[PDB]
Write a protein that binds this ligand. Structure first.
Ligand SMILES: [Zn+2]
Length: 87
């Protein structure tokens, strides 16, 4: 049919059984990634926003959401600079 109406164990679950599980792990990463993803295309709203990776820069220059999502991944792994930290 269209979708296997199930969400159990000891049964013939599809390969999508692992998908719903794996996304939870990387969703934790996504929470920090959103800071960079939004910073790249949306911005921050800061005076000292002048960062290599920012939309809210005093230059007013940004990227598209696809360009920002892939780069936010690349910023997550290096832990890039962020106008909204926590002391
Ligand atoms: Zn910024």
């Amino acid at each position: 049919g269209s979708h296997m109406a199930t969400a159990c164990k000891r049964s013939g679950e599809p390969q999508s059984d692992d998908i719903e599980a794996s996304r939870m792990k990387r969703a934790a990463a996504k929470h920090l990634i959103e800071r960079y993803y939004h910073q790249l295309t949306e911005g921050c709203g800061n005076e000292a926003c002048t960062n290599e990776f920012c939309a809210s820069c005093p230059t007013f220059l940004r990227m598209d959401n696809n360009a920002a999502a892939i780069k936010a991944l690349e910023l997550y792994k290096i832990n890039a600079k962020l106008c909204d930290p926590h002391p």
